[PDB]
């Protein structure tokens, strides 16, 4: 599931925190690297964070 960075089966604020930590350079343990590229453009960056925020805000 794209945006489920901790693979706990839901997309919520915990996933936002994990995306922010990854984009801040943190080694985030338990991170699903496959869930990071939410918009599928090959890169993990602030646009994926924005798409994650939109999922939490609107889904």
Partner 1 sequence: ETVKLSVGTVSGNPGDTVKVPVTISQVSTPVGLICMDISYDASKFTVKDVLPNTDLVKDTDNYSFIVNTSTPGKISITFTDPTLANYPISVDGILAYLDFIINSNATAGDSALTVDPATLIVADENDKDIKDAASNGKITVTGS
Residue 21 lies near partner 1 (rule: CB under 8 A): yes
Least Å distance, CB 3 to partner 1, is 13
Question: How many other CB atoms sit within 10 Å of the CB of residue 35?
Answer: 21
Residue 16 lies near partner 1 (rule: CB under 8 A): yes
CA-wise closest residue to 35 among 53, 20, 56, 52 = 52
For partner 1, the closer of residues 25 and 42 by Cβ is: 25
List, as residue ranges, the binding site: 4, 6, 8, 10, 15, 37, 39, 41, 43, 48
């Amino acid at each position: 599931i794209l945006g489920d960075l901790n693979d706990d089966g839901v997309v919520n604020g915990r996933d936002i925190v994990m995306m922010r930590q990854y984009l801040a350079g943190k080694t985030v343990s338990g991170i699903d690297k496959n869930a990071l590229d939410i918009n599928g453009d090959g890169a993990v960056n602030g646009d994926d964070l924005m798409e994650l925020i939109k999922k939490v805000s609107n889904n």
